[model samples]
Target chain A: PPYTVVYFPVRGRCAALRMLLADQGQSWKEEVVTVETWQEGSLKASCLYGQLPKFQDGDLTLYQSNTILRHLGRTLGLYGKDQQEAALVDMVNDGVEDLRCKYISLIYTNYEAGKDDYVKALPGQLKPFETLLSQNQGGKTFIVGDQISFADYNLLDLLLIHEVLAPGCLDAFPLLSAYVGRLSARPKLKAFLASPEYVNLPINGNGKQ
Target chain B: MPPYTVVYFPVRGRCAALRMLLADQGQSWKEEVVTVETWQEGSLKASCLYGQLPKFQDGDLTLYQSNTILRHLGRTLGLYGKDQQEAALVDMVNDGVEDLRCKYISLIYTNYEAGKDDYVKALPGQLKPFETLLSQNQGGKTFIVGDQISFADYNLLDLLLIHEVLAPGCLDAFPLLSAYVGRLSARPKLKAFLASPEYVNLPINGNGKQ
Candidate 1:
């Protein structure tokens, strides 16, 4: 059997894993747990560590999105060539997640005004990314050397989310915007983005968008 | 010559790296700067990746405290023997950091009474450690294993900071309190704690007594 991803019905938090799997052309089963089912304590038993987005590959079950992403990236040769590069990429991805957590807190707990503040604050947040992308890129292409890595995928996903949620937010960071655009247009990523699996979920809105 | 660590001076906000380094036997230098110093021109130039901490350099510099700690721990026999174990240990450490972050926000931002009220009102925020810690001692030894690792040091440091800051007045959770006490008391180097300027400057009342 293929790996099983146990999450809520909505493609909210779990979609990133799905996207990573799709990017790798890996076959995985999505075990969507409903509210009633999860609430009945099924999740407590079924989940490896009593958490959502639990990934099961045969007998190996894992928790934590970053760990899962790292495992997947390593498996697919998407991390980097060496330990240092992999660690660097992992750090960047984790940093992105940190920024996203801040965004989530501001938007969700604090609501509309907080989100507006975040949007206004986006330029400063995004400027560093422009510099990072520039530094990592040689005249050729990609964030880490010539090959496309998890960093590229992460950048694409981040930019794509920004595009959907706050359009034109990346305008000031032209290089990153262009880089993300290029990555998004790549056949594998483009195909995955346009696929039925991706189209089945909601794009941009409040609750778990 | 020791390795460099860049972090804020006051508050454990970013001094976690320095704390871990001190715990490790490995030679490392700490270059702490306050928030004021960060704003001053050219003060934070050596900090890799746009002024954040606790950045580190053994030879070539590296940024991001969590990542840096993982690598440092790996080098120092403070991390797990394998990838899976390392990831799990990291998850636990990161989770501790996450919990500490919440506590920090409450302590820093909210009114004490109001925050205490909210703290009491809310259901216990998912304490995953009850299970994770229990599993760590399946062999029935201390220090998260037979000896030391990065996660254990980090857990001890982070938990001590949290207990010192949060659970000073009350001890509703006796197990956690005892665990904290046990860990703090059992550490190899109490000299580090004794030497820290922050420790010297700590408040006289409340939890500092114990």
Candidate 2:
């Protein structure tokens, strides 16, 4: 199916979905919105949740980055191997989102006031992913089962953004530390991340983090 | 043996929706409630990855985050949706539920003293979207998205129930939501579960508020 991904040029919420598409070799058009354009009101007004990362697949319109991720995962055959793995996949993605929500809260709502406590509590927060890696195949392969699921892409984006959010966050856990290198080493995803399209934009909307 | 084991605080806070889903399905599961003393005594805080309650285990699988468990059960119990398009709608509903929930969480934990008054005043406005959503999803006494009950219904049900706890009879104004909640709670097994001592006896949160 034809695809159009509408999001800010930033990697903010769109990065995982973008990585999913790029990794799967799916062709998609970017309908990037700029800060000036987002303020002009029409685009933001048209959003379902008044947020970016709106996605369109031919006629089917979707918003909410995770919703889009699931939709794309379902259509692209990247969700999981079966029902059990799919549930596990959902579990991992949901965990990523939990931390992502906390990160978003820290970045947008409580950076100056809450950053210190948040980062101090960061190891415990990131520990789950490390534990997740440790539990599966000695942290040798993907985050979930042996096969690659959409959750890996989402987790990779999350891990990368957190590194930028709090430098050297993965240093404590060797598996999570190396997990980033393992996933990013893929040819297509590597090229995509290193490309000007992904690297040039700031990680967020307000330009803070 | 029951395949599911839920580990959480005795409170029904995050586990309410999933519990409702399970009861509504007549599915049996075990609950391991951690007491305040237990939480303070053991490594519960360190052991819990997110330092929150309502962890779940199914057979060999263990996970946290209530909505994850909800979605997992929805998938396993044939409640997610009939197909992919319907599943997307379910997620749209679930995400909407989560957003409104994030607001409620902020108000409850962050600024309950002063924010409560302003929030209660704004409650109707906050709730209007779901009411509007029910109407748009095709006037219902049915479910949130489709003719059948999806996981979103359980999620929406818990959201409505908690709000009613916060503000008595808050759904009275929205006829659609009111009827929606009415019928969902009236589901045979769920009605009993809602009225069960296990649910009502516990404080809604450790802070002693809804």
Candidate 3:
């Protein structure tokens, strides 16, 4: 395998990139880091930022999920066609990362107590992506330009998990609903989405969402 | 005047690094300062992509998110890196800087009173990776990730600058970072900008915590 993902058993941060690899028909090895193994402290200390979802691309090792995404985007021609488009792609991905952070916070730390407020604000939070999609290609194409970028994969994973967290979360946003359906229907991605490897893992750690 | 505009509140907040980048590179940009009162009026806030400050415009392209702005400048200004791998490394460094910045912002805005002690206590551990990064690159002689200065350098510099205010001697344990700050801050243009009222007068954060 040319690529390897070292992460926890749960999908958590690594879900989108894993989906990206699978959809691209790329083979990769997974180095699962169980909580029991993590508690031992050696690997944890070795991590650059003391975090998981560390990735390896040939000789280069990288941390930070978005960094890995952008790396793949750069190498796989998924960034965008031009500098301006690349900036727009980055803008979309940054927006996704921001919302994903909020989701992670809710799931890991404040799920029980903050879930209500989080759910209440979910529509407003999701509106940005819907607005983004509406602005580009009349919500028919990928998040940025005509072609799918790494941000699309991240945004797709985000919308999918949000659907699990709050059923009908994308109901009001028709573009987002269709966008998810459209992307999820791709042959390779659809098969990957249905496979046990992706299906069996929890969307987040601690079994919340 | 260069066709670069930054729209944000009066605080330094997320806009400092990009501002520093522009200054250090001798690029002039306009600042569209948004006050709390104006933000309370809601239209501009409504227009922001993520409903946050640090909205930026470079020529015809309007972008939100500070890192996006930084990378935009990095891309256009040739400050990203020499190639793909270096760019990924730059992004990695910036992401790391962003993680620490988030932690710092959370403490300052959310729980400064209760969180300050723990945050300062954990500061050294948090700041260690950067020292290691510096150590990896020419023994701290050059910028982060490569020989040339990247947008992440400006960002990491701002992070270190603010942390110094939060915990005065925080960089004492990391000599490379301590000198790295000294080296970056001493750049003539950046030095002038750092000393200017435009940079000095504004608060480090919105709530006057740091």
Candidate 4:
């Protein structure tokens, strides 16, 4: 029996972890929990933190999405080497989390009426990335440094999710759009997108541009 | 003179860096800018990313408030040491930022009407410190960790700022409150609060505390 995992059936949330794991070329069983079954399985009881996306790796269990992502990224060598680079990656990743919350609130909350304003604001939100990538890359490929760090993967995933969820969104961010296009063609990620696990999930959206 | 300084005026938004600098015991000038004047400051104009509060620096340089504070804390006295424990401390400090934001939103925005229900709802928000403080220190020491660290001092200062400025009417949190009272009463730099220019001429009801 491999290490078990439990998470909400949402792609943008817990499924992100699974996607990252798959990107790292690791195999694990994905257990989707229905509300009733989740209640009965003592899923809520075991989660002292009362959150979903719990990971059971062998004997050790853990929660907290950011912490879990950091742990997995470290194990998979996705997180950049050295503490400073890792911290920089974390800064970028956490900044994405901050922006994503605003994005979600604008789309899903009663604030949806402000969708156009929110969408218009997206370019300004992403402009920093264009500058950062240009400066950080200095004609190299990735965002953090030379190699494909966790920051790169997370940025790739973020752009992909944004495109699937909101088409015509990248028109404003030309550099970012170009970068995403370049990354999606990477063999490892391209293969992951073609995998059966990626295709069969209901939460899966169109990856093809 | 002595390398030009940076920070927004009218609020505590940019004061965190200044606080850390003082905590670091470094000498720096404070150039308090009026809201209108801030727009024209070239150094500030070039520096700010989101054009928000708490940007600071000297000469041709400037920095965002949180990042600047983190750097100052690290440089001064290893607020973020080079190990896992330091990383945890950094995370804990960031968590404090989150907690502060939550309290601000609830007290300032959510409870604008100041209804009893709103106040009641805010009590739990006030109690959040108890959990964080307890988690940070189960041994119930006066400080967060060792006898000397910026994290403990900054935590104490922030909690003191909240109690003095944000939650004047609320019931005092046990153990944590007792510890804070003792620290403030004894700490000489903190005890002479009026000496700090930041403490001077603050607006009446400016802090949103009732």
Residue B87 of model 4: what lDDT?
A: 41
Candidate closer to the true structure by TM-score (higher is better), 1 or 2: 2
- Model 3: what is its DockQ? 0.87
Question: Between which residue pairs do clashes occur in model 3?
Answer: none
Fnat value of model 4: 0.00
Writing each residue's lDDT as its tens digit, candidate 1 over A77-131 gives: 7877766666567567766776666666764677665777777777766766677
Candidate 2 runs further than 4 Å off:
A40-46
The positional error of residue A152 in candidate 3, measured at the CA in angstroms, is: 0.2
Q: What is the C-alpha local distance difference test score of each model?
A: 0.58, 0.85, 0.93, 0.56
Over the stretch B142-164, how does candidate 3's per-residue lDDT look in tens digits?
A: 89989999999999999999999
List model 1 lDDT by residue over B1-210, tens digit each.
Answer: 556555544555445534554654444566555554554655564334644555555457465645545544454453543455455445544544554555655555555555665653331343334334534554323444334444544554555545455555333443553464456445556456545675555342222221
lDDT of 4 by residue, A1-209 (tens): 25567875556455556656665667787787866677686777556344566777676465556556655655566666655555456656655665666755555663447767766777666666676677776524766666566666666666766676568777876678778877667766678777776655544322221
Candidate 3, residue A73: how far the Cα is off, in Å: 0.3
Estimate TM-scores for all models: 0.81, 0.93, 0.99, 0.72
Please, what are the lDDT tens digits per residue for candidate 4 over residues B1-210?
Answer: 745365665654425434543534544566666564656665655545544555655455444435444444454455643554434344444444444554554556456466545554655554555445544564545445333444435544554555455445443555565565466445665445434666544432334443
* RMSD to native, candidate 2: 2.0
Which consecutive 10 residues in model 1 chain B have the weakest lDDT in total? B201-210
lDDT of 2 by residue, A38-57 (tens): 88999876666677778888
Name the best candidate (by DockQ).
Answer: 3
Chain B TM for prediction 2:
0.94
Which portions of model 1 miss their true places by more than 4 Å?
Answer: A41-51, A203-209, B35-51, B65-80, B85-89, B110-113, B120-125, B128-132, B136-140, B143-148, B169-185, B190-210
Pick the lDDT winner: 3
Across B1-210, the per-residue lDDT of candidate 2 in tens digits comes to 898999988877778889889988989899998888888876976777567777798988777778889888988898988889889878988998898888887877778888887888888876776787789776766788778898889988988988998888888888999998888888889999989997888777667666
Docking tier of model 3: it is high
What does the lDDT come to for candidate 1? 0.58
